[PDB]
Symmetry: T
């Protein structure tokens, strides 16, 4: 019954992945954010300029908020939410911490972030799509607004590397 519910969950879990389910696809979207918290707190602590130092922390909150809301909205519509260290490493994709990062130059810290922020917006990009289809009215509109933040983070980061987003 306790154990019954958990196998039943995990059977349900990847049957749901493998025929793209809007939520299971956001299980990917979520764990990245979780990972990015780690990379961005690092960035706030061991990075160098005060300005970029704080903006990292700033984003480490807002990400933790996007986690919370998106999770809740998944969970309001009765869908499985990734909620543990096994499920996060296992269900993440294309973002990484990296011990070495403490002695990178900022430019290098930031360069990382510009890229693996675009790398967040792909599963988002089809998130979103599986939303409109599934008719997940509430969830969808919340995820669009995620794009924006994910997205607006870039040009901030870009002009910090005094250039344009038309490059990346």
């Amino acid at each position: 019954s306790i154990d019954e519910k958990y196998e039943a969950e995990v059977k349900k879990s990847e049957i749901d992945h493998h025929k793209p389910t809007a939520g299971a696809m956001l299980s990917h979207v979520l764990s990245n954010i979780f990972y990015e918290k780690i990379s961005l707190m690092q960035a706030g602590l061991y990075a160098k300029s005060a300005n970029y130092r704080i903006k990292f922390r700033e984003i480490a909150l807002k990400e933790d908020e996007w986690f919370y809301l998106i999770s809740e909205q998944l969970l309001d519509e009765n869908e499985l939410v990734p909620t543990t260290l096994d499920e996060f490493v296992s269900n993440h994709k294309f973002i990484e911490n990296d011990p070495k990062a403490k002695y990178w130059t900022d430019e290098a810290l930031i360069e990382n972030f510009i890229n693996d922020f675009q790398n967040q917006n792909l599963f988002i990009g089809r998130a979103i799509k599986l939303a409109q289809k599934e008719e997940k009215f509430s969830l969808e509109l919340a995820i669009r607004k995620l794009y924006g933040y994910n997205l607006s983070i870039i040009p901030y980061f870009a002009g910090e590397l005094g250039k344009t987003i038309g490059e990346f």
Copy 2:
């Protein structure tokens, strides 16, 4: 510079996690507070009752700032601080995650949580004397408080179950 300072850290790491520095015993605390958020953040999403749901999201927020502040007093006292997944998984001690805890009763997450925090304090009750020896002055204050905070969560949790602190 790149992969050299990383072993002047990683070796000094496992040498000091032995004849114990202050910031090593702490590297376990900091590393618990990381594991801990997740079990809370978990409970704050899954708990049957809405009071607890928010207490958890609140103890969580406070954890993810106890992380920030203990850290900032190490970085400040030129010492090592954990920062990546891999650093956390080696030095986490008695703290846990669980995909199976979603299905526990609210009663349980409290009890479990009572232990998790009792345990934080073994390592902090040491933090702290180590900081008392090394005469790292500012840091003593911040460690003392966190032992406090943690101490009070315990009876908060104790009373929800309808017992005293006296048992646990």
Copy 3:
């Protein structure tokens, strides 16, 4: 141009109601928000736990301010808004007043409020759909905030019964 203004309205309302427009479903939505306020208030006075008495009021307040929101959005797009006891009784569907719910329990109350709210969403969701077609661009946006709020109230209720959305 006097009593004339009126017969045209009841006629265009009944007509609009069968080959059904966004407006005319919302008619039911707003009429039920009205009835809801009433039960919520009643619960806001007579419920037995204070924590629940407060939430019952938090909600009834929100219910007013959704009612105002929708209705603006509506007549911004020149449609008829129900406005008066007669309109709210003939257009309301499946939501009850019952003068002895003051004798039921907080549970019995919360129980029924989940039924109420499920039923509420049927027509939101209807219209929702009716809003996409009619290219009521600022209104659909808004009716999805409703769909969702309602959803958050229903799990909020579920866990106060000690339950997951699942059973409802």
Copy 4:
């Protein structure tokens, strides 16, 4: 038992109404607030001037406030409070809703209310007196404020028709 309770209830309302009681009086008072809330909400949607839309909304907000206020007061003295639509319809008095009134001029809405709030006031004033008799010490304090509020709203309105209270 539930039904044991309800019939004692209804028997008593009738006993108390006819050899009149502070609560009984205040049951039409409250019913009329409930009606007022609607005519006000209608006018704060459909009236022409924005100055009057906002005021009318302000007055409805406040009636709700007065509702909760007088009701808890009465509850504290173990008194019955009209809580459902079917209680509000039986016990209301001289306040109407009119679907036609959306088609009225601002000047006639104002003028209509001068009347309602005036009529509201003759139950209030009677009530006021019973509360004294019945030594309901904190109830009386409250009704006197309701009385006063209606008087401030009457010459609000009187001055908006460029007249003076004296006329009406």
Copy 5:
């Protein structure tokens, strides 16, 4: 002279107590607030549920507020106010402290207070009446609020034992 004053004082208290005075009555009122403050403070330290700890503290805070309030009121009318422990012990009435009660259940603390605030109320209500008689115009206004506050706190508590005021 100092002692000239004090003995006039004590003689008068006794004259005023026995052919009773608004002030005299209010001297047990105030003494009971002073006692209440303690039982409340005890329960807001030792009670099990955090919801009740915070409430109990809130009620003690407020009793202090009511203390200062009623006292300055009485001072303005040149009246004697109990100010010391030895005045509080003589003039208190039906409120006890119990060191044992830390070992009581929340349910019995709640229940005990229902009783105190009820008993507090029969001096208040008597007082209320003398204030009128003695034409103490702004004093009366005040005691009526104290009376009401106790009534709101009684069914606060009654609903927390899942009952209704009517019982007690």
Copy 6:
């Protein structure tokens, strides 16, 4: 017509004054506030101690507040309010202005006011009583606060001369 109105006005003031009316009484009350405002403003400019300058200004501010307050109250009951200088001079009573008093000591300003506020109070108290008689339900509530405010300001002042109310 304008002049039709004014002479009805003045005739009535005289009828109402002599077989005395709550409004009539309150017309000297208000006149004395108007005078008070001046002596207070003078002392809050010319007094020596900054502690007394600020207090005196605070008391003038508040008299203005009480002015507007009592007046609208009276307006709501369709009553005449003294509004001009020539009404304030006829109807004032025992409050003076003195250009000499800028040359007084703080101690004698304080002392002078003890007197004014005392005298203010015997119209207020009379007024208070008529309001009752005349069943002016929200007026009475108000005057009682004015009465109380003057009493709090009297022993404010009494304690500033290191004495106690009892003396004056």
Copy 7:
């Protein structure tokens, strides 16, 4: 040094008034601000639109706080300030009280308030000039804030008549 303090003052005031100083014009300025407050208040109670009743009060408030400003600035530079009904009637010029303005219209009111304010500026502007010569450095600065406020009130009034400054 007693009644002596006074004759010197009336003599130095009359003297200062003819070969006229900044002080002695301000005497008229402050005395008119006083009279103004009175008419504004009267309008703040009796005017017919509420929007105008509020502005009439906004202003009278500002009029108090200019009166205080000027007067500080003044006696900061050791000059005599009018302070008392006798000073304010003998030094006031061209500003009226009139007990039947409560019967005129908002327009008739606003009309006259433009006349009033124009006249006010004559003496500000006088003194202004008187302040430049006397090298009253902090006072002139301040009297120009007055000149202007007054100016904003006069067009404010002009447009509520439906007009440009031009016609006045």
Copy 8:
């Protein structure tokens, strides 16, 4: 780099203002909102009545931030955004300025303003479907709202004239 990218923009400009991109149809909207401020900012300085004066300065403020935010969602979705006088004068459509409008009645500026905004929406009702096609996700939300905002200004303006939205 200098004068080369400027035609890779200016030519891509007039090619896309043809087979329409999202950000081109918008370049007209953004370009209206620029023209619009000026006619408002105008009215906010010249209007006969002080209510309108502020509504205009407020719709103005909101326009000059609708500019900022639509822009920031283009810059973000690497697209062109207008920015100089010359860009605005070519792409402004049906929007106007006028030195002669100072002398209009307040009535007129409302009517005129009703048109200006009706017109904004032709181009936004297109904005928007173009954004719906290109699957520019974040931007859809922001365009939808602005169609809303604009939609509500219309009936605000309609009711000031004493008509419904139904005409315009």
Copy 9:
């Protein structure tokens, strides 16, 4: 497990009191804070300068919130807290109530409050020391905030006598 819970407590309290623990000194500390509140209140009502009446209240407020602080910190570390009139009279030391201090002077009051506070610190300081040994890490930290507050009150008092700490 009933009345048993109690005898164990009085026995472990008396035992703990002789070979004295941090807990058992604090017992005296808290019991004196209690007595202090009482005298401070009394002074907060009867003192003669208002400035002193306010500070006497500022303090008594702080005294409550130290009492709560200490007591938390305490039972966080499972120790017994005095809680009830009997505990506070048998454990209090050297701090007085005296019903005729209302007749002494502000000076005579302040004088004695320095004696009171000196005496208070004796036991804080004791325990303080008792807290260092018992490794009550979060409690000692806190008892030093007390030591100091008390110290600031004593010079605050010294200078209101016109004196330096020196003479006390």
Copy 10:
């Protein structure tokens, strides 16, 4: 009459320019600010560093505020205000937008601003002068404060090009 007022305005307008009129000279001062809005919003949008990005927007508000106030103060003293796109380009002088500016380096954006901010302060410099002469008491002091902002903007901008204003 409508057309009569506009020729009459324009005849008056340049007769007023050509014999320097303080206001007509500020008609120049104003339009620059208007132009600078355009150049600075550009700067906020398409520039690169976050810090300088925002400070541009910041100044685009404050300029829009200087527009507003200065305009109002002109307009209080009955003087013509530039209030349209024809009058702004026609009556500006020595500031320019420049499409190309989107791809300038910041240094280059900023370099522009330092210069054409000095270029604002010349007509200001003689603004100011025509004020003192015309005796425009209110206007003058407002324009001095404009200097400061215009002026303090420079050294901000200067040290951003790590240098001194003693250069430019």
Copy 11:
């Protein structure tokens, strides 16, 4: 560059402290305000009474911002501003420090302080005309105010001693 510009300053310093620039006469003011803080900051630590203690810490704060703002209007008007110990000790004039003033009566520090500030104004009453000549426009305003601020501290101080401003 290094030791060359320092004499193009230091010589221009002593040449301009002769045929006086604005910013030289000020260099003495700025240099007083530095000395002044210290005697205040002193008094704010040592004064017998707690009112004065805070007035001083407050005048102090205000001084240490009058320093900041006068400075920022020089730096802005490319002029020299004092900044080091040695600059201050040469140009301080009549201002003082004293280790012996700790033991003065509160009376004395007021009197002394009255002089210190009377003296500030000789140099500011000159500041100011120098700024009036050089047509340094913004700076005139700021100097005028400070003469004001200083002017008002004087009578604040005068009245504490129980005299008028008229003596000092």
Copy 12:
């Protein structure tokens, strides 16, 4: 007696230095902070980057606050506090202003500060020590927190010179 207390002070003063007295050692700690105010206000005024410009001012406050608190806490425990320009230069050690500093590069301004902030933390380092020994409970904990600020200032300043504190 006045002169008696000052020799007696200075005899006491260096007897206290020369056998390290915790307070006399903080007399050193204090005067540096005082000196640093001078160096940091300089830095805010004549430095170049806006960011580092303000952070200097920020620290000039916080230092002035550390002065205040630390002083007070010394002074609560009856110890001599440095409180004058003679005692500050005489009792400082190892921090210096430097006229030349106005034309240093920021890097050079900052480089200074990093060093002579470590140079503050040495006497602090043994401050602190003499505290624990002397048993100065309150003082100690305040000084630890000084370390932190002094300390955390460094890594801010360090990463501004894009490096680590492990260098300096």
